């Protein structure tokens, strides 16, 4: 699942948590088996304008 979120919203990806993003558009089940991969992309997605 490829998606871009805020750096402060990384803690919401964990299952059984709270947050606006973790409860409205994306949510993981309580029996999720896998790994969460995330990295900084400031010099790739962000624009000066």
């Amino acid at each position: 699942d490829s998606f871009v979120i805020r750096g402060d919203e990384v803690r919401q990806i964990a299952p059984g948590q709270t947050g606006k993003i973790a409860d409205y558009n994306y949510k993981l089940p309580d029996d999720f088996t896998g790994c969460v991969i995330a990295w900084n992309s400031n010099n790739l997605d962000s624009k000066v304008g």
């Binding site: 299952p15 059984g16 709270t18 309580d30």
Partner: protein, 49 residues
């Protein structure tokens, strides 16, 4: 004291039933003995313990 054996058996059965019905009020290390007070005070990931 002529019928002490039957009375003792009845008292033992009653005491066993009372202990079994009173063990529900114990906490056993939990936060409370009532499940409604636990399922309405914590989230769905910490109340499971």
């Amino acid at each position: 004291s002529a019928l002490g054996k039957l009375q003792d058996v009845v008292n033992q059965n009653a005491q066993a039933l009372n202990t079994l019905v009173k063990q529900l009020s114990s906490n056993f290390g939990a936060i409370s003995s009532v499940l409604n007070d636990i399922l309405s005070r914590l989230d769905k990931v910490e109340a499971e313990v």
